[model samples]
Target: SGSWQTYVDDHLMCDIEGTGQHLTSAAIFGTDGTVWAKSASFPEFKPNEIDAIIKEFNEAGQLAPTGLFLGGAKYMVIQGEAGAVIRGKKGAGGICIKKTGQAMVFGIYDEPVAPGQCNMVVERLGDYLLDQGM
Candidate 1:
């Protein structure tokens, strides 16, 4: 939920903690309901960020994307490479969504990957989601 803004629109949303530019990743549910972006929380690399995301949230039930499973997130267009924001570091990027029943759909924004292979990173996220059994 915290990363909602970042995953949706990278660089468009500024971090309240003045950490750094954030980005968004779109996720589509199996129900094909509303579209939501799993944004990255503030402070790209502070402390326990990954741990916090893996932790269970209070109202959110878990540190996952907000508005999920309620027909809130679907058909989103993300933008950015899976790096400091989601993954702990570079060369370790991948889409991380809760298991089924936790959240059905997961998506990543569009971003360049390698030379002449633009959007490869984002496509890799798609593959990652598929591997998650989405």
Candidate 2:
């Protein structure tokens, strides 16, 4: 609550231009798979699906075998990692995630949005949250 939901809405979900910019949506999910905040378009996660997502950070490349899920859509791993960052691609759409001190920040985008933009945006928010003690 507090400014958490506001930031997610005003900036993360939509830029100053009153649109999402390159992001389709964004979300902040606690390390335990609890939702802190999400954009209007973001989807709910099933309990079991949340566990699978958290595990992706524990076991790298696991999603390559098990598949990547974000906002209810599936994606394929793009050379994964653990505890810091993770990214995936599906057709022209993809996702970028940053593991902060106590949360996982995400940038979900597609088509004209370059993958690097998602990484930059998600990582920036992640660092901000982590530096503030999340």
Candidate 3:
């Protein structure tokens, strides 16, 4: 029922690991469902709920001067109970998500991620995901 793990393990994992951060957990949400890579350590969303959230974020992006939208954010961040969830988008059509504030960075890869690196990581992941049409 899936071929995503190939890219997730080979491509995404290598990129994330190369960042010097440790793996914790990660996920890719879309209009349909989600594809994820999680560790026993960290956790990570639903589809309809995801779609709704994406829609809301898109609206927020439209309001912003960036001309960037959710699922395609050049760079964006939001704060909440968990921490600052960094997000970004690429022109190719992809979204990135990363939650900061823990031993590991949550999203895209379960690993120790730096707050400063969130946007860049997500942006790269977005480019990859979009390119793969995931």
Candidate 4:
């Protein structure tokens, strides 16, 4: 049977890295905000930082007021849907996070990558797992 790491490495990260550009770091964390699987280059985040994300993770609007935090970078929430997905941007870089039933998939992308591109990759991964029962 496959584990979290297998899906993360073979499915998730590959999709992000497969773009060959834009994405810098990515991760998959539980709806409860516990660390699950992340890219090898993913950075460490403090408990408070993670908590901050979970606070406004599932629901939208909440994040738009205060912005989104990930990978130690602060991204201003531009738009998102209730209990669905959120997109944040800080200059040319941006972060896309999508929540399913159990976990959330995120992608931090740099300049030169269209916001649409980042959205596609992260959302696609999240959609698959949501369809897979997680």
Highest TM-score, which number?
Answer: 2
**TM-score rank, highest first?**
2, 4, 3, 1
Alpha-carbon lDDT of model 4: 0.75
Report the error of model 1 at residue 7, Å: 6.4
**Model 4: per-residue Cα lDDT over 65-134, one tens digit each:** 5667665778888777667788889899888888888998877777777788878888888999889898
* TM-score computed on alpha carbons, candidate 2: 0.86
Candidate 2 residue 121 Cα shift, in angstroms, is 0.8
lDDT against true structure, model 1: 0.31
| Alpha-carbon lDDT, every model | 0.31, 0.77, 0.39, 0.75
Show where candidate 1 strays beyond 4 Å.
1-33, 38-117
TM-scores for every predicted model:
0.24, 0.86, 0.46, 0.84
By lDDT, who's the top model here?
2
Residues forming the 10-long window of minimal summed lDDT in candidate 4: 10-19
Instruction: Supply candidate 3's per-residue lDDT for 42.
Output: 27
* Candidate 1 lDDT by residue in tens digits, 1-134: 36534433442233323533223344432222223443343122222432343332212233335312212222211232322122211232223333232332333322332211213333344455556564
lDDT of 2 by residue, 1-134 (tens): 47678757755666523444658888888989888888877766576766777877877666676677755778888854576898989898898888877888877888788788788778888888888898
lDDT per residue (tens digit) for residues 19-74 in model 3: 56533334443433444443333232334434544444434443234432323323
Worst window of 10 by summed lDDT in candidate 1: 83-92
Cα RMSD of predicted structure 3: 10.8
Q: What RMSD value applies to candidate 4?
A: 2.3
Tell how far residue 111 is off in model 2, in angstroms: 1.7
